[PDB]
Amino acid sequence: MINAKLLQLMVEHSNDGIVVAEQEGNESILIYVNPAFERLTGYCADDILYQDCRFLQGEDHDQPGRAIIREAIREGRPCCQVLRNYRKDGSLFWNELSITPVHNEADQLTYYIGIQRDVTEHQQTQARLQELQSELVHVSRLSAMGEMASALAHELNQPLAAISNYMKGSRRLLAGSSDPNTPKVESALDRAAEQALRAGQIIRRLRDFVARGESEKRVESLSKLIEEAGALGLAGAREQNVQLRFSLDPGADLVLADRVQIQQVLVNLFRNALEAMAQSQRRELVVTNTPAADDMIEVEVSDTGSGFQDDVIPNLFQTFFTTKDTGMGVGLSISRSIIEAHGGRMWAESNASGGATFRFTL
Amino acid sequence: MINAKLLQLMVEHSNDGIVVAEQEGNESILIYVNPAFERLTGYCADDILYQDCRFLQGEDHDQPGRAIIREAIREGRPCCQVLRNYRKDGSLFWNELSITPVHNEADQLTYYIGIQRDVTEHQQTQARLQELQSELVHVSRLSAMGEMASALAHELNQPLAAISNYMKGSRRLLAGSSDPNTPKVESALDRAAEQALRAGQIIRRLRDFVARGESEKRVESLSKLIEEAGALGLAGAREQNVQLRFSLDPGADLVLADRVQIQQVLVNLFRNALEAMAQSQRRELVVTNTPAADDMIEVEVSDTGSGFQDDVIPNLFQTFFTTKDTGMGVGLSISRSIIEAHGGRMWAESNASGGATFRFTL
Ligand SMILES: Cc1cc2c(cc1C)N(C[C@H](O)[C@H](O)[C@H](O)COP(=O)(O)O)C1=NC(=O)NC(=O)[C@@H]1N2
Ligand SMILES: Cc1cc2c(cc1C)N(C[C@H](O)[C@H](O)[C@H](O)COP(=O)(O)O)C1=NC(=O)NC(=O)[C@@H]1N2
Ligand SMILES: Nc1ncnc2c1ncn2[C@@H]1O[C@H](COP(=O)(O)OP(=O)(O)OP(=O)(O)O)[C@@H](O)[C@H]1O
Ligand SMILES: Nc1ncnc2c1ncn2[C@@H]1O[C@H](COP(=O)(O)OP(=O)(O)OP(=O)(O)O)[C@@H](O)[C@H]1O
């Protein structure tokens, strides 16, 4: 096979944590650890040997991985779990633990071999991603409701005002009369007019119910929010072989923006480019920042997608104009309103590759 | 320094893959593998020994992990990466590989120890989660706009119809009189009524523009979609010490549903329960499905959160009613409309633990 002592050496000098324990009733006493386990746990070998690892949980006793591992050890099946542990210094970390029970026949004794890895970075990144998910969902819901309400307010402000004007006109016409049915009819109009007024107020009410979304701005790094937005919006990039190119300038990264609003602008651009790029020979998405003019900096996002026929391009930012069967046509309108609220100007043009290049300034 | 021979046995009988290779210039020849590696690769020891793992890469040569591993091994740093490999049958799997180089001083030779895990399930689950996240965002925007349109339609159906009826009444009342303005007024009223009708139609138009999501029915298994919904809504469970209990029935898996709509209903219930249970000493969430009645299956989700005071309970399902500053009061309204559109029954109750129990049927 392999020189056993060399195997001991290789196990001792590994970077991943390796432990050997022995079964004693309800205890799993440690009989061997490697220096990687020392650096990971922050304890010395002589302090911890011939105890059970339960102490690594500290005061955090009620974790399900504990019961899962207890049952797996009882039944004798190997298992993989994640637990919350604390080192000697008291710092928290997450431990990926893979236990394999083995029955040594030479001793007729049950032992366990445990592989441990420090997965704190992975869990932290997962938490950041889920936080991004929650806030992206919330602000997308807000922007959708707001644009729907504003469009309804306009499209109903026209006929409602028309109705009120017809009421005023008919009343003015009937005022020049003395017939018996005129008063009654007149009163009737008033009732209708009364209701009419309410409708308008109601609209504004619901309108101001959707406009209570906060409009703050803060100093934000463009690099960070570009990475967060790529992490969110670029699901299909791996599967659809999308070539990413970030042409960034480190001296011009900080803009005054709400990071979630810029995230949703970029998310919308990414979703649109990947959806458009379903049938494209070249699949390359480039994001670039450049100085543009008058102390403002321009961000460009270019794709090689299906592009726009000539009749479509000047209708892009209009609310509810859509090309996709499953679209809604509010993404670009909301994005443009966000960019303009930030003091910039956003526009689009066809690219030489037959796809599309979008630009905005901050 | 402990037993040493016993150790070789412990490594041989591990469930995780463990390999030892030796450096040959720029090559890493395999000199020891464990039966776990055989099970992982589907190859025999005599078949696979004394080569370099490269081959397990198959035809997938242009992966970044290859260059990362080459640079780390050349420079001498240990590293952990993920690669795509193929077994003997040609099936693809993903390998999480942790390599640690060690310089044996007794021989003055470079060896490597490699920990291998089959991490295909994790990658697949993450890809499914990202797809679910994308569709969740899309349909949340969709449902938000739809609910806003339906709420405005509800709150305006009274005054619009009232105005139109007052117009019809005024027209009947004035019809028959002998006055100079009567003909004109008549036409005017009609025009006004016309406008009113148009206004109503407009709302439905915009409503039906967002309601063009397909209204399909399903065969999907509830166990799977419950796990998917937990994957989206129950991220914080590990970090917030939430106790999960899934009481599932293999006999009660088929429901009549639109899968994206049930995804969003469950996501909303999960988010709401975690939000309510943020400050709770006892935190327990139970989801259970059973054959109740009406040839339909009922799913129950109960929590022990802060709950609702008695004056709130009958206001839960009202659109736009919210308690939390970061809420919107549309989650429950959308959930109710989805359940009623699907033919089901939705309800709520206070729990004995002070929390909340929600029920639905499918
Ligand atoms: C070989 C081996 C290795 C480990 C562990 C167990 C065995 C047998 N454990 C588990 C822990 O030692 C207890 O087995 C666990 O708490 C279950 O026992 P209970 O407290 O339920 O009796 C690790 N649990 C940890 O918290 N950290 C570790 O790194 C430990 N690794
Ligand atoms: C100890 C050890 C263990 C492994 C591996 C390498 C070492 C040193 N590799 C990497 C692979 O064998 C090549 O080293 C890799 O392709 C880099 O070498 P290049 O082709 O750049 O020369 C595994 N790569 C795999 O495809 N699967 C494995 O399980 C291999 N495990
Ligand atoms: N990269 C692109 N290539 C081609 N057309 C695009 C591109 N980006 C936007 N468009 C055009 O803009 C329209 C609206 O896109 P927008 O993202 O604003 O809304 P939508 O995609 O229709 O729906 P959603 O609200 O889900 O995004 C698309 O239907 C398409 O006509
Ligand atoms: N299980 C529950 N636990 C606690 N509160 C609940 C529960 N179910 C409903 N509620 C109450 O319902 C109200 C609105 O919930 P709903 O999810 O519909 O909207 P929201 O939580 O205010 O925000 P959003 O609409 O964005 O979800 C809140 O006041 C909330 O306290």
Coordinates of N, CA, C and O in Angstrom, one line a residue, chain A residues 2 4-5 7-10 13 15-16 31-32 81-82 84 94 96 98 100 102 104 112-113 115 117 122 130 133-134 137 140-142 144-145 148 152 155-156 158-159 162-163 166-167 170 173-174 176-177 179 181 184-185 188-189 191-192 195-196 202 206 209-210 212 232 235 264 268 271 320 325-327 330, chain B residues 1-2 4-6 8-10 13-16 32 80 96 98 100 102 104 111-113 117 122 130 133-134 136-138 140-142 144-145 148 152 155-156 159 163 166-167 170 173-174 177-179 181 184-185 188-189 191-192 195-196 198-199 202-203 206 209 212 235 238-239 241 271 320 326-328 330:
Chain A
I2 N 0.8 2.0 1.1 CA 1.6 3.2 1.3 C 2.3 3.1 2.7 O 1.6 2.7 3.7
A4 N 3.0 3.5 6.1 CA 2.0 4.0 7.1 C 2.5 5.2 7.8 O 1.7 6.2 8.1
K5 N 3.8 5.3 8.2 CA 4.3 6.4 8.9 C 4.3 7.7 8.0 O 4.1 8.8 8.4
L7 N 2.0 8.1 5.8 CA 0.6 8.5 5.9 C 0.3 9.4 7.1 O -0.3 10.4 7.0
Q8 N 0.8 8.9 8.2 CA 0.7 9.8 9.5 C 1.3 11.1 9.2 O 0.7 12.1 9.6
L9 N 2.5 11.2 8.6 CA 3.1 12.5 8.3 C 2.2 13.4 7.5 O 2.0 14.6 7.7
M10 N 1.7 12.8 6.4 CA 0.8 13.6 5.5 C -0.4 14.1 6.2 O -0.9 15.2 5.9
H13 N 0.5 17.0 8.5 CA 0.8 18.2 7.8 C -0.3 18.7 6.8 O 0.0 19.4 5.9
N15 N -3.7 20.8 5.6 CA -4.3 22.1 5.9 C -5.8 22.0 6.5 O -6.2 22.9 7.2
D16 N -6.5 20.9 6.1 CA -7.8 20.7 6.7 C -7.7 20.0 8.0 O -6.8 19.2 8.3
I31 N -8.7 11.2 20.6 CA -7.4 10.5 20.8 C -6.4 11.0 19.8 O -5.2 10.7 20.0
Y32 N -6.8 11.8 18.8 CA -5.8 12.4 17.9 C -6.3 13.6 17.2 O -7.4 13.6 16.7
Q81 N -22.4 17.7 8.6 CA -23.2 18.7 9.1 C -22.4 20.0 9.3 O -21.2 20.0 9.0
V82 N -23.1 21.1 9.7 CA -22.4 22.4 9.9 C -22.9 22.8 11.3 O -24.1 22.8 11.7
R84 N -22.1 25.8 14.7 CA -21.6 27.0 15.2 C -20.7 26.8 16.3 O -21.1 26.2 17.3
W94 N -18.0 28.9 11.8 CA -18.8 27.8 11.3 C -17.9 26.7 10.9 O -17.0 26.9 10.2
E96 N -17.7 23.0 9.1 CA -18.2 21.9 8.3 C -17.5 20.6 8.8 O -16.3 20.4 8.7
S98 N -17.5 16.4 8.9 CA -17.8 15.1 8.3 C -17.3 14.0 9.1 O -16.1 13.8 9.3
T100 N -17.1 9.9 10.1 CA -17.2 8.5 9.6 C -16.9 7.6 10.8 O -15.8 7.6 11.3
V102 N -15.9 4.0 12.4 CA -15.2 2.8 11.9 C -15.0 1.8 13.1 O -14.7 2.3 14.2
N104 N -12.8 -0.8 14.7 CA -11.5 -1.4 14.7 C -11.7 -2.8 15.3 O -12.0 -3.0 16.5
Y112 N -14.1 7.1 15.5 CA -14.7 8.0 14.6 C -13.6 8.8 14.0 O -12.7 9.2 14.7
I113 N -13.7 9.1 12.7 CA -12.8 10.0 12.0 C -13.5 11.2 11.5 O -14.6 11.1 10.9
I115 N -13.5 15.0 9.6 CA -12.9 16.0 8.7 C -13.6 17.3 9.0 O -14.8 17.4 8.9
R117 N -13.7 21.6 8.2 CA -13.3 22.7 7.4 C -13.9 24.0 7.9 O -15.1 24.0 8.4
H122 N -18.0 31.2 3.5 CA -19.1 30.8 2.6 C -20.4 31.1 3.2 O -21.3 31.7 2.5
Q130 N -28.5 36.5 0.6 CA -29.9 36.5 0.9 C -30.4 37.9 1.3 O -31.6 38.2 1.1
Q133 N -31.1 39.6 -1.8 CA -32.4 39.1 -2.3 C -33.6 39.8 -1.7 O -34.5 40.3 -2.4
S134 N -33.6 39.8 -0.3 CA -34.7 40.4 0.4 C -34.9 41.9 0.0 O -36.0 42.3 -0.4
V137 N -36.1 42.3 -3.7 CA -37.5 42.0 -3.8 C -38.4 43.2 -3.3 O -39.3 43.6 -3.9
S140 N -38.1 46.3 -5.6 CA -38.8 46.1 -6.8 C -40.3 46.1 -6.7 O -41.0 46.7 -7.5
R141 N -40.8 45.5 -5.6 CA -42.3 45.6 -5.3 C -42.7 47.1 -5.2 O -43.7 47.5 -5.8
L142 N -41.9 47.8 -4.4 CA -42.2 49.3 -4.3 C -42.3 50.0 -5.6 O -43.3 50.7 -5.9
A144 N -42.6 48.8 -8.7 CA -43.7 48.3 -9.5 C -45.0 49.0 -9.1 O -45.8 49.5 -9.9
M145 N -45.3 49.0 -7.8 CA -46.6 49.6 -7.3 C -46.6 51.1 -7.6 O -47.6 51.6 -8.0
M148 N -47.2 51.6 -11.5 CA -48.6 51.2 -11.8 C -49.5 52.3 -11.3 O -50.5 52.7 -12.0
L152 N -52.0 54.7 -13.6 CA -53.4 54.7 -13.4 C -53.9 56.1 -13.1 O -55.0 56.5 -13.5
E155 N -54.0 58.1 -16.5 CA -55.0 57.5 -17.4 C -56.4 57.7 -16.9 O -57.4 57.6 -17.6
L156 N -56.6 57.9 -15.6 CA -57.9 58.1 -15.0 C -58.1 59.6 -14.7 O -59.3 60.0 -14.6
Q158 N -57.6 61.8 -16.8 CA -58.2 62.4 -18.0 C -59.7 62.2 -18.0 O -60.5 63.2 -18.0
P159 N -60.3 61.0 -18.0 CA -61.7 60.8 -18.0 C -62.5 61.4 -16.8 O -63.6 61.8 -17.0
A162 N -62.9 64.9 -17.4 CA -63.9 65.1 -18.5 C -65.3 65.0 -17.9 O -66.2 65.8 -18.2
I163 N -65.5 64.0 -17.0 CA -66.8 63.8 -16.4 C -67.2 65.0 -15.6 O -68.3 65.5 -15.7
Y166 N -68.2 67.8 -17.9 CA -69.5 67.6 -18.4 C -70.6 68.0 -17.4 O -71.7 68.5 -17.7
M167 N -70.3 67.6 -16.1 CA -71.3 68.0 -15.1 C -71.4 69.5 -15.0 O -72.5 70.0 -14.9
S170 N -73.4 70.8 -18.1 CA -74.8 70.5 -18.1 C -75.5 71.3 -17.0 O -76.6 71.8 -17.2
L173 N -75.9 74.8 -18.4 CA -77.0 74.8 -19.4 C -78.4 74.8 -18.7 O -79.3 75.5 -19.2
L174 N -78.6 73.9 -17.7 CA -79.8 73.8 -17.0 C -80.2 75.0 -16.1 O -81.3 75.3 -15.8
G176 N -80.1 78.0 -16.9 CA -81.0 78.9 -17.7 C -82.3 78.3 -18.0 O -82.7 78.2 -19.2
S177 N -83.0 77.8 -17.0 CA -84.3 77.2 -17.2 C -85.2 77.3 -16.0 O -84.7 77.6 -14.9
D179 N -88.1 74.9 -15.8 CA -89.0 73.7 -16.0 C -89.1 73.0 -14.6 O -88.2 73.0 -13.8
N181 N -88.9 69.7 -13.9 CA -88.0 68.6 -13.7 C -86.5 69.1 -13.5 O -85.7 68.3 -13.1
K184 N -84.9 68.7 -9.6 CA -84.6 67.3 -9.3 C -83.4 66.9 -10.1 O -82.4 66.5 -9.5
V185 N -83.5 66.9 -11.4 CA -82.3 66.6 -12.3 C -81.1 67.2 -11.8 O -80.0 66.6 -11.6
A188 N -79.7 65.7 -8.8 CA -79.1 64.4 -9.2 C -77.7 64.6 -9.6 O -76.8 63.9 -9.1
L189 N -77.4 65.5 -10.5 CA -76.1 65.8 -11.0 C -75.2 66.1 -9.8 O -74.1 65.4 -9.7
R191 N -75.3 65.0 -6.7 CA -74.9 63.7 -6.1 C -73.8 63.0 -6.9 O -72.8 62.7 -6.3
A192 N -74.0 62.9 -8.2 CA -73.0 62.3 -9.0 C -71.7 63.1 -8.9 O -70.7 62.5 -8.6
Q195 N -69.9 62.2 -5.8 CA -69.2 61.0 -5.9 C -68.0 61.2 -6.8 O -66.8 60.8 -6.4
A196 N -68.1 62.0 -7.9 CA -67.0 62.2 -8.8 C -65.8 62.8 -8.0 O -64.7 62.2 -8.1
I202 N -59.6 59.8 -4.0 CA -59.2 58.4 -3.7 C -58.0 58.1 -4.5 O -57.0 57.6 -3.9
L206 N -54.5 56.7 -2.8 CA -53.7 55.6 -3.2 C -52.3 55.9 -3.8 O -51.3 55.3 -3.5
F209 N -50.2 56.7 -1.2 CA -49.8 55.5 -0.5 C -48.6 54.8 -1.1 O -47.9 54.1 -0.4
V210 N -48.4 54.9 -2.4 CA -47.3 54.3 -3.0 C -46.1 55.2 -3.1 O -45.0 54.7 -3.3
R212 N -44.8 56.8 -0.6 CA -44.1 56.9 0.7 C -42.9 56.0 0.7 O -42.4 55.7 1.8
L232 N -26.5 39.0 -8.5 CA -27.9 38.8 -8.5 C -28.5 38.5 -9.9 O -29.2 37.6 -10.1
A235 N -27.6 35.2 -13.5 CA -27.8 33.7 -13.3 C -27.5 33.0 -14.6 O -26.7 32.0 -14.6
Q264 N -31.0 47.8 -8.7 CA -32.2 47.4 -9.4 C -32.1 47.8 -10.9 O -32.6 47.1 -11.8
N268 N -32.1 45.1 -13.8 CA -33.0 45.2 -15.0 C -32.2 45.2 -16.3 O -32.6 44.5 -17.3
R271 N -31.0 41.4 -16.8 CA -32.1 40.5 -17.2 C -32.5 40.8 -18.6 O -32.7 39.8 -19.4
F320 N -45.0 50.8 -19.9 CA -45.8 49.7 -20.3 C -45.6 49.2 -21.8 O -46.3 48.3 -22.2
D325 N -43.0 38.5 -24.3 CA -44.3 37.9 -24.0 C -44.6 37.9 -22.5 O -45.7 38.0 -22.0
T326 N -43.5 37.7 -21.7 CA -43.6 37.6 -20.2 C -43.1 38.9 -19.5 O -42.9 38.9 -18.3
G327 N -42.9 40.0 -20.3 CA -42.5 41.2 -19.7 C -43.6 42.1 -19.2 O -44.8 41.7 -19.2
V330 N -42.0 48.1 -17.4 CA -41.8 49.1 -16.3 C -40.4 49.2 -15.9 O -40.0 50.2 -15.4
Chain B
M1 N 1.4 11.3 16.4 CA 2.2 10.6 17.4 C 1.3 9.5 18.2 O 1.8 8.9 19.1
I2 N 0.1 9.3 17.7 CA -0.8 8.4 18.4 C -1.2 7.2 17.6 O -1.9 7.3 16.6
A4 N -0.5 5.5 15.0 CA 0.1 5.5 13.6 C -0.5 4.4 12.7 O -1.1 4.8 11.7
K5 N -0.5 3.1 13.1 CA -1.0 2.1 12.2 C -2.5 2.2 12.2 O -3.2 2.2 11.1
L6 N -3.1 2.3 13.4 CA -4.5 2.6 13.5 C -4.9 3.7 12.6 O -6.0 3.6 12.0
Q8 N -3.8 4.6 9.6 CA -3.9 4.2 8.2 C -5.3 3.5 8.1 O -6.0 3.7 7.1
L9 N -5.7 2.7 9.1 CA -7.0 2.1 9.0 C -8.1 3.2 9.0 O -9.1 3.1 8.2
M10 N -8.0 4.2 9.9 CA -9.0 5.2 10.0 C -9.2 6.0 8.6 O -10.3 6.3 8.2
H13 N -10.9 3.7 5.9 CA -12.4 3.6 6.0 C -13.1 4.9 6.2 O -14.2 4.9 6.7
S14 N -12.6 6.0 5.6 CA -13.3 7.2 5.7 C -14.4 7.3 4.6 O -14.3 6.6 3.6
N15 N -15.4 8.1 4.8 CA -16.4 8.3 3.8 C -16.1 9.4 2.8 O -16.6 9.4 1.7
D16 N -15.2 10.4 3.2 CA -14.7 11.4 2.3 C -13.5 10.9 1.6 O -12.7 10.1 2.1
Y32 N -1.4 6.8 -3.5 CA -2.3 6.1 -2.5 C -3.7 6.7 -2.7 O -3.9 8.0 -2.7
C80 N -8.1 25.2 -2.2 CA -9.3 24.4 -2.4 C -10.1 25.0 -3.6 O -10.2 26.2 -3.7
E96 N -15.1 18.9 -5.1 CA -14.5 19.9 -4.2 C -13.2 19.3 -3.7 O -13.2 18.3 -3.0
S98 N -9.4 19.8 -2.0 CA -8.5 20.5 -1.1 C -7.2 19.9 -1.1 O -7.0 18.7 -0.6
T100 N -3.1 20.0 -0.2 CA -2.1 20.5 0.7 C -0.7 19.9 0.4 O -0.6 18.6 0.5
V102 N 3.2 19.0 1.0 CA 4.1 18.7 2.2 C 5.5 18.2 1.7 O 5.5 17.4 0.8
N104 N 8.5 16.1 2.5 CA 9.0 15.1 3.3 C 10.5 15.3 3.4 O 11.2 15.2 2.4
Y111 N 5.3 15.8 -1.6 CA 4.0 15.0 -1.6 C 2.9 15.9 -1.5 O 3.0 17.1 -1.1
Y112 N 1.7 15.4 -1.9 CA 0.5 16.2 -1.8 C -0.6 15.3 -1.2 O -0.7 14.1 -1.5
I113 N -1.4 15.9 -0.3 CA -2.6 15.2 0.3 C -3.8 15.9 -0.2 O -3.9 17.2 -0.2
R117 N -14.5 15.8 -2.1 CA -15.9 15.6 -1.8 C -16.7 15.8 -3.0 O -16.4 16.6 -3.9
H122 N -24.6 20.4 -3.9 CA -24.6 21.8 -3.5 C -24.7 22.8 -4.7 O -25.4 23.8 -4.7
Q130 N -31.0 30.1 -7.4 CA -30.9 31.4 -8.2 C -32.0 31.5 -9.2 O -32.6 32.6 -9.4
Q133 N -35.1 32.5 -7.2 CA -35.0 33.9 -6.8 C -35.4 34.8 -8.0 O -36.1 35.8 -7.8
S134 N -34.9 34.5 -9.2 CA -35.2 35.4 -10.3 C -36.7 35.4 -10.6 O -37.3 36.4 -10.7
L136 N -39.1 34.6 -8.5 CA -39.7 35.2 -7.3 C -39.8 36.7 -7.5 O -40.8 37.3 -7.2
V137 N -38.7 37.3 -7.8 CA -38.6 38.7 -8.0 C -39.6 39.2 -9.1 O -40.4 40.1 -8.9
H138 N -39.6 38.5 -10.3 CA -40.5 38.8 -11.4 C -41.9 38.7 -11.0 O -42.7 39.7 -11.2
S140 N -43.2 38.7 -8.0 CA -43.6 39.7 -6.9 C -43.9 41.0 -7.5 O -44.9 41.7 -7.1
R141 N -43.1 41.5 -8.5 CA -43.4 42.7 -9.2 C -44.8 42.6 -9.8 O -45.6 43.5 -9.7
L142 N -45.0 41.5 -10.5 CA -46.3 41.3 -11.2 C -47.4 41.3 -10.2 O -48.4 42.0 -10.5
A144 N -47.6 42.6 -7.2 CA -47.8 43.9 -6.6 C -48.6 44.8 -7.5 O -49.6 45.4 -7.1
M145 N -48.2 44.9 -8.8 CA -49.0 45.8 -9.7 C -50.4 45.3 -9.9 O -51.3 46.1 -9.9
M148 N -52.4 46.3 -6.8 CA -52.7 47.7 -6.8 C -53.9 48.0 -7.7 O -54.8 48.8 -7.4
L152 N -57.6 49.5 -6.5 CA -58.2 50.7 -7.0 C -59.5 50.4 -7.7 O -60.5 51.1 -7.5
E155 N -62.1 49.9 -4.8 CA -62.4 51.1 -4.2 C -63.1 52.1 -5.1 O -63.8 53.1 -4.6
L156 N -63.0 52.0 -6.4 CA -63.7 52.8 -7.3 C -65.0 52.3 -8.0 O -65.7 53.0 -8.6
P159 N -68.1 54.4 -6.6 CA -68.5 55.8 -7.1 C -68.7 55.8 -8.6 O -69.5 56.6 -9.0
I163 N -72.1 57.2 -10.1 CA -72.2 58.3 -11.0 C -72.9 58.0 -12.3 O -73.8 58.7 -12.7
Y166 N -76.6 57.9 -11.4 CA -77.1 59.2 -11.3 C -77.3 59.9 -12.7 O -78.3 60.6 -12.9
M167 N -76.4 59.6 -13.6 CA -76.6 60.1 -15.0 C -77.8 59.5 -15.7 O -78.6 60.2 -16.3
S170 N -80.9 61.1 -14.2 CA -81.1 62.5 -14.7 C -81.6 62.5 -16.1 O -82.4 63.3 -16.5
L173 N -85.2 61.5 -16.0 CA -86.0 62.6 -15.4 C -86.2 63.8 -16.4 O -87.3 64.3 -16.5
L174 N -85.1 64.2 -17.1 CA -85.2 65.3 -18.0 C -85.9 65.0 -19.3 O -86.4 65.9 -20.0
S177 N -89.2 67.0 -20.9 CA -89.4 68.4 -20.7 C -89.3 69.2 -22.0 O -88.8 68.7 -23.0
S178 N -89.7 70.4 -21.9 CA -89.6 71.3 -23.1 C -88.8 72.6 -22.7 O -89.3 73.5 -22.0
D179 N -87.6 72.6 -23.1 CA -86.6 73.6 -22.7 C -85.6 73.8 -23.8 O -85.4 72.9 -24.6
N181 N -82.3 74.2 -23.5 CA -81.0 73.5 -23.2 C -81.2 72.0 -23.1 O -80.2 71.2 -23.1
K184 N -79.3 69.5 -25.9 CA -77.9 69.6 -25.7 C -77.5 68.9 -24.4 O -76.7 67.9 -24.4
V185 N -78.1 69.3 -23.3 CA -77.8 68.6 -22.0 C -77.8 67.1 -22.1 O -76.9 66.4 -21.7
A188 N -74.8 65.9 -23.7 CA -73.8 66.1 -22.8 C -73.7 64.9 -21.8 O -72.7 64.3 -21.5
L189 N -74.9 64.7 -21.1 CA -75.0 63.6 -20.1 C -74.5 62.3 -20.7 O -73.6 61.6 -20.1
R191 N -72.4 61.8 -23.2 CA -71.0 61.9 -23.3 C -70.3 61.7 -21.9 O -69.4 60.8 -21.8
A192 N -70.8 62.4 -20.9 CA -70.3 62.2 -19.5 C -70.4 60.7 -19.2 O -69.4 60.1 -18.8
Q195 N -67.8 58.8 -21.0 CA -66.5 58.9 -20.3 C -66.4 58.0 -19.1 O -65.4 57.3 -19.0
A196 N -67.4 58.0 -18.3 CA -67.4 57.2 -17.1 C -67.1 55.7 -17.5 O -66.2 55.1 -17.0
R198 N -65.7 54.5 -20.2 CA -64.3 54.4 -20.6 C -63.4 54.3 -19.4 O -62.6 53.4 -19.4
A199 N -63.6 55.2 -18.5 CA -62.7 55.2 -17.3 C -62.6 53.8 -16.7 O -61.5 53.3 -16.5
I202 N -60.7 51.4 -18.6 CA -59.2 51.7 -18.5 C -58.6 50.9 -17.4 O -57.6 50.1 -17.6
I203 N -59.2 50.9 -16.2 CA -58.7 50.2 -15.1 C -58.5 48.7 -15.5 O -57.4 48.1 -15.4
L206 N -55.5 48.0 -17.8 CA -54.2 47.9 -17.1 C -54.2 46.7 -16.2 O -53.2 46.0 -16.1
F209 N -53.6 43.8 -18.2 CA -52.2 43.8 -18.8 C -51.2 43.1 -17.8 O -50.3 42.6 -18.3
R212 N -51.9 38.8 -17.3 CA -51.6 37.9 -18.4 C -50.6 36.9 -18.1 O -50.0 36.3 -19.0
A235 N -34.0 31.2 4.9 CA -32.5 31.4 4.9 C -32.0 31.6 6.3 O -31.1 30.9 6.8
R238 N -31.1 29.0 10.4 CA -29.9 28.6 11.1 C -29.4 29.7 12.0 O -29.0 29.5 13.1
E239 N -29.3 30.9 11.4 CA -28.7 32.1 12.1 C -29.6 32.6 13.3 O -29.1 33.0 14.3
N241 N -31.8 30.7 14.9 CA -32.2 29.6 15.8 C -33.7 29.3 15.7 O -34.4 29.2 16.7
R271 N -41.5 34.4 5.2 CA -41.0 35.7 5.5 C -41.7 36.4 6.7 O -41.1 36.9 7.6
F320 N -53.2 46.4 2.1 CA -52.4 47.6 2.4 C -52.3 47.9 3.9 O -51.7 48.8 4.4
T326 N -41.3 48.2 7.6 CA -40.7 47.7 6.4 C -41.7 46.7 5.7 O -41.3 46.0 4.7
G327 N -43.0 46.7 6.1 CA -44.0 45.9 5.5 C -44.7 46.6 4.4 O -44.4 47.8 4.1
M328 N -45.6 45.9 3.7 CA -46.4 46.6 2.7 C -47.9 46.2 2.8 O -48.7 46.9 2.2
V330 N -49.5 43.8 1.5 CA -50.0 43.2 0.2 C -49.7 41.7 0.2 O -50.4 41.0 -0.5

